[PDB]
């Protein structure tokens, strides 16, 4: 109780233990919606002209 | 163009001296085309 208490000295307090973990996890949002990958030849035509 | 007489009594091959000043000239054509839908896209069928 009075020396088997836990302390947070140098180490505990690094940077590190931010930078490792990105924060993808907390704000993206599972989508589930299939990407768009539309062609170009569909949307600017055929080219008539030549 | 500011006398009725010479605005009024003239030819068909002249204008108001007045009309010099309408020097801009807008050309427009009105044409088809095809606006395709699928697959949640649009697009269009003729480029040019």
Same mark, same amino acid.
């Given at each position: 109780?009075?020396?088997?208490?836990?302390?947070?000295?140098?180490?505990?307090?690094?940077?590190?233990?931010?930078?490792?973990?990105?924060?993808?996890?907390?704000?993206?949002?599972?989508?589930?919606?299939?990407? %768009?990958?539309?062609?170009?030849?569909?949307? %600017?035509?055929?080219?008539?002209?030549? | 163009?500011?006398?009725?007489?010479?605005?009024?009594?003239?030819?068909?091959?002249?204008?108001?001296?007045?009309?010099?000043?309408?020097?801009? &000239?807008?050309?427009?054509?009105?044409?088809?085309?095809?606006?395709?839908?699928?697959?949640?896209?649009?697009? &269009?069928?003729?480029?040019?």
């Amino acid at each position: 109780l009075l020396r088997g208490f836990e302390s947070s000295l140098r180490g505990s307090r690094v940077r590190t233990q931010i930078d490792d973990k990105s924060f993808i996890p907390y704000t993206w949002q599972m989508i589930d919606v299939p990407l %768009a990958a539309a062609k170009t030849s569909f949307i %600017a035509g055929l080219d008539t002209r030549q | 163009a500011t006398s009725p007489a010479a605005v009024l009594g003239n030819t068909e091959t002249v204008t108001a001296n007045t009309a010099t000043l309408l020097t801009a &000239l807008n050309i427009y054509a009105k044409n088809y085309n095809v606006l395709r839908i699928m697959s949640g896209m649009g697009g &269009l069928a003729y480029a040019n």
